[PDB]
Structure 1
């Protein structure tokens, strides 16, 4: 699953591939603008506050 992630106070952006769909469910059933918790998102995302901003489906 691709993750186009941006840090905008310094204008940086990068893509992740976060597999193991049994833990991606923090994003599931969540709309644009809602807040997820990065603790379950990954081990390196300790204390990050990710806001949903968009995305592209298959096709």
Structure 2
């Protein structure tokens, strides 16, 4: 599953690709318009606050 991630202060954006299962399910059962924490998924994402704003299925 891809991850279209964007930073709207610098204006840059970057995609990301992750493969396992257990890091994903923090996202699960969430409507869009709320936040998560990247420490649940990423050691490179310590302290990071997100928000979910769209997707596309298979």
Structure-2-length-normalised TM-score:
0.91
Unaligned runs of 5+ in 1: none
- Which residue in 2 is equivalent to 1:57? 57
For residues 5-58 of structure 1, give each alpha carbon's deviation from its aligned partner in whole angstroms, at most 9, with x where no partner exists. 000011111110111112210101011011111101211001110111111111
SS at match of 1:25: coil
Aligned residue pairs: how many? 58
List 4+ stretches of structure 1 deviating above 6 A.
Answer: none
